[PDB]
Short mmCIF file of C-alpha atoms and ligand atoms in Angstrom, two decimals:
data_model
loop_
_atom_site.label_atom_id
_atom_site.label_comp_id
_atom_site.label_asym_id
_atom_site.label_seq_id
_atom_site.Cartn_x
_atom_site.Cartn_y
_atom_site.Cartn_z
CA UNK A 1 3.06 28.26 1.03
CA UNK A 2 3.73 28.11 4.66
CA UNK A 3 1.67 26.08 6.98
CA UNK A 4 2.19 27.04 10.46
CA UNK A 5 0.89 24.74 13.01
CA UNK A 6 -1.52 26.37 15.36
CA UNK A 7 -2.65 24.71 18.62
CA UNK A 8 -6.40 24.30 19.01
CA UNK A 9 -7.25 27.20 21.33
CA UNK A 10 -6.82 26.14 24.91
CA UNK A 11 -6.32 22.45 24.45
CA UNK A 12 -3.60 20.43 26.07
CA UNK A 13 -2.28 16.93 26.09
CA UNK A 14 -5.10 15.69 28.29
CA UNK A 15 -7.45 16.98 25.69
CA UNK A 16 -5.73 14.95 23.04
CA UNK A 17 -5.42 11.83 25.13
CA UNK A 18 -9.23 11.80 25.34
CA UNK A 19 -9.71 11.95 21.62
CA UNK A 20 -7.19 9.05 21.43
CA UNK A 21 -8.96 7.03 24.08
CA UNK A 22 -12.25 7.52 22.25
CA UNK A 23 -10.90 6.20 18.98
CA UNK A 24 -9.34 3.31 20.73
CA UNK A 25 -12.44 2.37 22.64
CA UNK A 26 -14.25 2.47 19.40
CA UNK A 27 -11.77 0.24 17.65
CA UNK A 28 -12.17 -2.21 20.39
CA UNK A 29 -15.88 -2.21 20.14
CA UNK A 30 -16.31 -2.41 16.34
CA UNK A 31 -14.29 -5.57 15.86
CA UNK A 32 -16.48 -7.18 13.24
CA UNK A 33 -15.35 -4.94 10.45
CA UNK A 34 -13.98 -6.52 7.29
CA UNK A 35 -14.38 -10.01 8.71
CA UNK A 36 -13.08 -9.34 12.09
CA UNK A 37 -9.98 -7.50 10.94
CA UNK A 38 -11.24 -4.37 12.68
CA UNK A 39 -10.78 -0.74 11.57
CA UNK A 40 -7.11 -0.41 12.53
CA UNK A 41 -5.76 -1.03 9.09
CA UNK A 42 -8.05 1.24 7.28
CA UNK A 43 -7.33 4.13 9.65
CA UNK A 44 -3.68 3.60 9.09
CA UNK A 45 -4.21 3.78 5.39
CA UNK A 46 -6.38 6.86 5.70
CA UNK A 47 -3.70 8.79 7.58
CA UNK A 48 -1.27 7.81 4.92
CA UNK A 49 -3.53 8.98 2.07
CA UNK A 50 -4.37 12.39 3.45
CA UNK A 51 -0.66 12.74 3.91
CA UNK A 52 0.74 11.36 0.65
CA UNK A 53 -0.69 14.08 -1.51
CA UNK A 54 2.11 16.34 -0.37
CA UNK A 55 4.45 17.94 -2.84
CA UNK A 56 7.78 19.07 -1.44
CA UNK A 57 8.15 21.23 -4.41
CA UNK A 58 5.41 23.72 -3.79
CA UNK A 59 4.32 22.69 -0.31
CA UNK A 60 0.79 21.90 -1.53
CA UNK A 61 -0.99 18.92 -0.08
CA UNK A 62 -0.01 16.93 2.97
CA UNK A 63 -2.03 16.47 6.21
CA UNK A 64 -2.34 20.13 7.24
CA UNK A 65 -5.51 21.30 5.74
CA UNK A 66 -7.63 18.19 6.15
CA UNK A 67 -8.86 18.63 2.59
CA UNK A 68 -9.92 14.91 2.44
CA UNK A 69 -13.16 16.26 3.80
CA UNK A 70 -13.91 17.85 0.44
CA UNK A 71 -15.50 16.00 -2.56
CA UNK A 72 -12.55 16.36 -4.99
CA UNK A 73 -10.21 14.58 -2.51
CA UNK A 74 -12.86 12.42 -0.93
CA UNK A 75 -13.86 11.05 -4.27
CA UNK A 76 -10.31 10.35 -5.50
CA UNK A 77 -10.21 6.88 -7.03
CA UNK A 78 -6.98 6.20 -5.25
CA UNK A 79 -9.11 6.85 -2.18
CA UNK A 80 -11.70 4.09 -2.75
CA UNK A 81 -12.56 2.33 0.48
CA UNK A 82 -11.32 5.20 2.77
CA UNK A 83 -14.87 6.36 3.27
CA UNK A 84 -15.27 3.63 5.79
CA UNK A 85 -12.57 5.09 7.95
CA UNK A 86 -14.05 8.41 7.66
CA UNK A 87 -17.41 7.11 8.73
CA UNK A 88 -15.70 5.49 11.72
CA UNK A 89 -14.30 8.83 12.75
CA UNK A 90 -17.35 10.98 12.16
CA UNK A 91 -19.00 10.46 15.54
CA UNK A 92 -15.77 10.95 17.17
CA UNK A 93 -15.42 14.34 15.71
CA UNK A 94 -18.99 15.08 16.77
CA UNK A 95 -17.96 14.37 20.29
CA UNK A 96 -14.85 16.50 19.95
CA UNK A 97 -15.72 19.18 17.61
CA UNK A 98 -12.87 21.54 18.40
CA UNK A 99 -10.26 19.11 16.91
CA UNK A 100 -9.18 20.09 13.48
CA UNK A 101 -9.71 17.54 10.70
CA UNK A 102 -6.10 16.99 9.79
CA UNK A 103 -5.54 16.50 13.48
CA UNK A 104 -8.19 13.82 13.75
CA UNK A 105 -7.33 11.86 10.60
CA UNK A 106 -3.81 11.74 11.58
CA UNK A 107 -4.42 10.87 15.14
CA UNK A 108 -6.55 7.91 14.09
CA UNK A 109 -3.50 6.49 12.28
CA UNK A 110 -1.35 6.85 15.45
CA UNK A 111 -4.05 5.38 17.59
CA UNK A 112 -4.50 2.49 15.23
CA UNK A 113 -0.83 1.53 15.19
CA UNK A 114 -0.35 1.82 18.88
CA UNK A 115 -3.50 -0.09 19.76
CA UNK A 116 -2.49 -2.85 17.26
CA UNK A 117 0.60 -3.32 19.26
CA UNK A 118 2.92 -1.22 17.16
CA UNK A 119 5.50 1.18 18.50
CA UNK A 120 4.67 4.52 20.06
CA UNK A 121 4.48 7.28 17.48
CA UNK A 122 5.00 10.80 18.84
CA UNK A 123 2.35 13.04 17.40
CA UNK A 124 1.92 16.82 17.09
CA UNK A 125 -1.42 18.88 17.09
CA UNK A 126 -1.66 22.24 15.24
CA UNK A 127 -3.07 21.25 11.81
CA UNK A 128 -5.58 23.71 10.51
CA UNK A 129 -8.48 23.26 8.32
CA UNK A 130 -8.07 25.01 4.99
CA UNK A 131 -10.59 25.94 2.34
CA UNK A 132 -12.04 23.79 -0.39
CA UNK A 133 -9.90 25.56 -2.91
CA UNK A 134 -6.70 24.12 -1.29
CA UNK A 135 -7.81 20.61 -2.10
CA UNK A 136 -5.09 18.98 -4.20
CA UNK A 137 -6.06 17.49 -7.51
CA UNK A 138 -6.46 13.69 -7.85
CA UNK A 139 -3.49 11.84 -9.23
CA UNK A 140 -0.91 12.51 -6.56
CA UNK A 141 -1.18 9.04 -5.00
CA UNK A 142 1.04 6.18 -6.28
CA UNK A 143 0.10 3.29 -8.56
CA UNK A 144 0.66 -0.28 -7.54
CA UNK A 145 1.59 -1.96 -10.79
CA UNK A 146 5.07 -0.58 -10.90
CA UNK A 147 8.58 -1.11 -9.86
CA UNK A 148 11.33 -0.07 -7.52
CA UNK A 149 12.39 2.81 -9.75
CA UNK A 150 8.97 4.24 -9.73
CA UNK A 151 8.70 3.70 -5.99
CA UNK A 152 11.97 5.50 -5.34
CA UNK A 153 11.07 8.33 -7.57
CA UNK A 154 7.66 8.67 -6.05
CA UNK A 155 8.69 8.83 -2.43
CA UNK A 156 11.27 11.25 -3.25
CA UNK A 157 8.59 13.88 -3.78
CA UNK A 158 7.75 13.39 -0.12
CA UNK A 159 11.32 13.52 0.89
CA UNK A 160 11.59 9.96 1.91
CA UNK A 161 14.85 8.02 1.39
CA UNK A 162 15.21 4.29 0.86
CA UNK A 163 15.20 3.47 4.42
CA UNK A 164 12.10 5.44 5.07
CA UNK A 165 10.32 3.79 2.21
CA UNK A 166 11.16 0.30 3.33
CA UNK A 167 10.12 1.11 6.83
CA UNK A 168 6.85 2.64 5.84
CA UNK A 169 6.06 -0.27 3.62
CA UNK A 170 6.04 -2.79 6.43
CA UNK A 171 2.57 -1.41 7.25
CA UNK A 172 1.45 -3.74 4.44
CA UNK A 173 1.49 -6.40 7.17
CA UNK A 174 -1.87 -4.84 8.06
CA UNK A 175 -5.22 -5.29 6.47
CA UNK A 176 -5.56 -6.56 2.99
CA UNK A 177 -6.41 -5.52 -0.59
CA UNK A 178 -9.94 -5.61 -1.78
CA UNK A 179 -10.91 -6.16 -5.26
CA UNK A 180 -13.74 -3.71 -5.38
CA UNK A 181 -11.51 -0.98 -3.97
CA UNK A 182 -8.27 -1.31 -5.81
CA UNK A 183 -8.41 -4.16 -8.25
CA UNK A 184 -6.23 -6.43 -5.95
CA UNK A 185 -7.41 -9.12 -3.73
CA UNK A 186 -5.90 -10.73 -0.62
CA UNK A 187 -4.02 -10.16 2.71
CA UNK A 188 -0.20 -9.89 2.88
CA UNK A 189 0.04 -12.22 5.77
CA UNK A 190 -1.59 -13.96 8.66
CA UNK A 191 -1.66 -11.59 11.68
CA UNK A 192 -3.36 -8.87 9.87
CA UNK A 193 -4.36 -6.71 12.68
CA UNK A 194 -1.48 -6.88 14.88
CA UNK A 195 1.60 -4.85 14.09
CA UNK A 196 4.73 -6.96 13.44
CA UNK A 197 7.65 -7.46 10.92
CA UNK A 198 5.62 -10.18 9.29
CA UNK A 199 5.66 -8.29 6.02
CA UNK A 200 9.38 -8.69 5.51
CA UNK A 201 9.35 -12.31 6.58
CA UNK A 202 6.73 -13.20 4.06
CA UNK A 203 8.36 -11.39 1.30
CA UNK A 204 11.59 -13.19 2.02
CA UNK A 205 10.12 -16.63 2.89
CA UNK A 206 7.27 -17.45 0.62
CA UNK A 207 7.29 -18.89 -2.85
CA UNK A 208 5.55 -16.25 -4.85
CA UNK A 209 3.87 -16.89 -8.14
CA UNK A 210 3.03 -14.14 -10.54
CA UNK A 211 -0.49 -14.34 -11.63
CA UNK A 212 -3.35 -12.24 -12.86
CA UNK A 213 -6.38 -11.64 -10.76
CA UNK A 214 -10.03 -11.25 -11.50
CA UNK A 215 -9.61 -7.54 -12.13
CA UNK A 216 -7.05 -8.53 -14.72
CA UNK A 217 -4.13 -7.12 -12.85
CA UNK A 218 -1.01 -8.83 -11.85
CA UNK A 219 -0.10 -9.87 -8.38
CA UNK A 220 2.32 -12.25 -6.67
CA UNK A 221 0.44 -15.09 -5.00
CA UNK A 222 1.72 -17.43 -2.42
CA UNK A 223 0.74 -20.96 -1.50
CA UNK A 224 0.01 -19.85 2.03
CA UNK A 225 -2.76 -17.77 0.53
CA UNK A 226 -0.95 -14.41 0.67
CA UNK A 227 -0.32 -11.74 -1.93
CA UNK A 228 2.10 -8.94 -2.74
CA UNK A 229 1.58 -6.04 -5.04
CA UNK A 230 4.16 -5.46 -7.78
CA UNK A 231 5.36 -2.47 -5.74
CA UNK A 232 5.69 -4.67 -2.69
CA UNK A 233 7.57 -7.24 -4.66
CA UNK A 234 9.90 -4.62 -6.19
CA UNK A 235 11.49 -4.32 -2.74
CA UNK A 236 13.29 -7.66 -3.25
CA UNK A 237 14.15 -6.94 -6.78
CA UNK A 238 16.19 -3.86 -5.71
CA UNK A 239 19.56 -4.37 -4.18
CA UNK A 240 19.29 -1.41 -1.99
CA UNK A 241 15.73 -2.14 -0.87
CA UNK A 242 16.48 -5.83 -0.32
CA UNK A 243 19.10 -5.45 2.29
CA UNK A 244 16.90 -3.16 4.34
CA UNK A 245 14.11 -5.71 3.98
CA UNK A 246 16.52 -8.26 5.33
CA UNK A 247 17.39 -6.18 8.22
CA UNK A 248 13.81 -5.77 9.28
CA UNK A 249 13.19 -9.40 8.73
CA UNK A 250 15.80 -9.88 11.33
CA UNK A 251 15.18 -7.16 13.83
CA UNK A 252 11.69 -6.21 14.73
CA UNK A 253 12.99 -3.51 17.04
CA UNK A 254 14.92 -1.84 14.37
CA UNK A 255 11.83 -1.97 12.27
CA UNK A 256 9.63 -0.42 14.94
CA UNK A 257 12.06 2.49 15.60
CA UNK A 258 12.52 3.28 12.00
CA UNK A 259 8.82 2.98 11.31
CA UNK A 260 7.94 5.29 14.15
CA UNK A 261 10.30 7.93 12.97
CA UNK A 262 9.19 7.62 9.34
CA UNK A 263 5.54 7.63 10.05
CA UNK A 264 5.66 10.81 12.13
CA UNK A 265 7.72 12.50 9.52
CA UNK A 266 5.25 11.42 6.91
CA UNK A 267 2.40 12.93 8.90
CA UNK A 268 4.30 16.06 9.74
CA UNK A 269 5.32 16.81 6.21
CA UNK A 270 4.70 20.40 4.98
CA UNK A 271 4.01 21.78 8.39
CA UNK A 272 5.96 24.45 10.10
CA UNK A 273 6.09 24.22 13.91
CA UNK A 274 6.83 27.52 15.69
CA UNK A 275 9.44 27.45 18.46
CA UNK A 276 6.84 27.91 21.05
CA UNK A 277 4.73 24.93 19.80
CA UNK A 278 4.39 22.19 22.38
CA UNK A 279 6.60 19.11 22.16
CA UNK A 280 5.07 16.12 20.52
CA UNK A 281 2.81 14.01 22.57
CA UNK A 282 3.27 10.33 23.21
CA UNK A 283 -0.19 8.91 24.02
CA UNK A 284 -0.82 6.13 26.50
CA UNK A 285 -2.54 3.12 25.18
CA UNK A 286 -5.79 1.95 26.72
CA UNK A 287 -4.06 -0.77 28.41
CA UNK A 288 -1.57 1.57 29.88
CA UNK A 289 -4.39 3.44 31.39
CA UNK A 290 -6.11 0.29 32.68
CA UNK A 291 -9.23 1.01 30.49
C1 LIG B 1 4.12 2.00 -2.86
C2 LIG B 1 3.25 2.74 -2.18
C3 LIG B 1 1.89 2.16 -1.86
C4 LIG B 1 1.09 1.47 -2.69
C5 LIG B 1 1.03 1.59 -4.22
C6 LIG B 1 -0.06 1.08 -1.89
C7 LIG B 1 -1.12 0.38 -2.39
C8 LIG B 1 -2.07 -0.10 -1.51
C9 LIG B 1 -3.25 -0.73 -2.00
C10 LIG B 1 -3.47 -1.05 -3.49
C11 LIG B 1 -4.02 -1.06 -0.94
C12 LIG B 1 -5.31 -1.90 -0.86
C13 LIG B 1 -6.62 -1.10 -1.03
C14 LIG B 1 -7.91 -1.90 -0.99
O1 LIG B 1 -8.24 -2.58 -1.99
O2 LIG B 1 -8.64 -1.73 0.02
C15 LIG B 1 -3.25 -0.78 0.24
C16 LIG B 1 -3.81 -1.04 1.48
C17 LIG B 1 -3.17 -0.66 2.62
N1 LIG B 1 -2.16 0.27 2.65
FE1 LIG B 1 -0.78 0.60 1.05
N2 LIG B 1 0.24 1.24 -0.56
C18 LIG B 1 1.46 1.87 -0.51
C19 LIG B 1 1.92 2.56 0.58
C20 LIG B 1 1.45 2.35 1.86
C21 LIG B 1 2.06 2.89 3.04
C22 LIG B 1 3.22 3.91 3.09
C23 LIG B 1 1.20 2.68 4.04
C24 LIG B 1 1.30 3.12 5.49
C25 LIG B 1 2.46 3.47 6.02
C26 LIG B 1 0.12 1.86 3.55
C27 LIG B 1 -0.78 1.23 4.41
C28 LIG B 1 -1.76 0.38 3.95
C29 LIG B 1 -2.71 -0.32 4.80
C30 LIG B 1 -2.51 -0.55 6.31
C31 LIG B 1 -3.55 -0.96 3.99
C32 LIG B 1 -4.61 -2.01 4.30
C33 LIG B 1 -5.94 -1.28 4.30
C34 LIG B 1 -7.15 -2.14 4.52
O3 LIG B 1 -7.01 -3.29 5.00
O4 LIG B 1 -8.19 -1.57 4.14
N3 LIG B 1 0.40 1.51 2.24
N4 LIG B 1 -2.13 -0.02 -0.12
#
């Protein structure tokens, strides 16, 4: 399987910037969502989920084909709760109907990070919608009740090394778990809709208590009212993971740079970009445009 990226006929950067600005204006406006957390977090998660189905072995899955749009994928249990991000994006697509799906889902993730004060994430257009039959089967997304070994193994299928995994994970500073969706309940920290290294700090600074929740699953609870999934916790149990955690706990810039790089890679997995494809775009935030 080869997935060549193909630019939406006749579109340029300015075309993309507009889709970006629309998402952003919308994020700004719909701030009541999930108790005033806003849709940032969920869009970030969505871009990760349409992208995490990839399989470096056979090149199936990944962001390319925008298959989330199909029932099989859309209804994946691991996907519970993502429908709200989709719904957020729907009208945007209606306004900009020539954008491919995979392009839109993934751009929402970039927009979300950047508008939530994260680092700039270069992004590339060119994703093409594929047929319903290219929809990966459910079961490719990772479980949360596991450990570092599982985590390592898992991310390996997506070609991510330890450093990439710890970087990516710091996105857990955003949003929160919801019982009805995954069987976990609680936020990982305090500034849940602003992008910072908070995740590492909490994991290193709080006094976590293992407990079972109402769904009868285990989670690490903190006095401050925070939580950590077993997979989150596993990062301090592993020697290799732990020192990277420490590093991010100490240097938010390092964290941002590594995150940026890992995130793009994650969203660009499985796609082939011809030599004549345009360079990646770096979008301006609203604020940079004075809007
Ligand atoms: C070990 C791998 C992963 C595990 C098992 C996992 C598990 C989870 C779970 C259980 C949820 C909460 C769902 C809910 O009840 O609404 C969650 C939410 C979240 N995930 Fe992860 N995750 C992992 C990887 C990632 C990564 C790589 C990213 C992005 C880079 C991501 C970004 C987020 C975001 C921002 C949310 C909050 C969503 C919201 O507030 O609705 N997670 N993840």
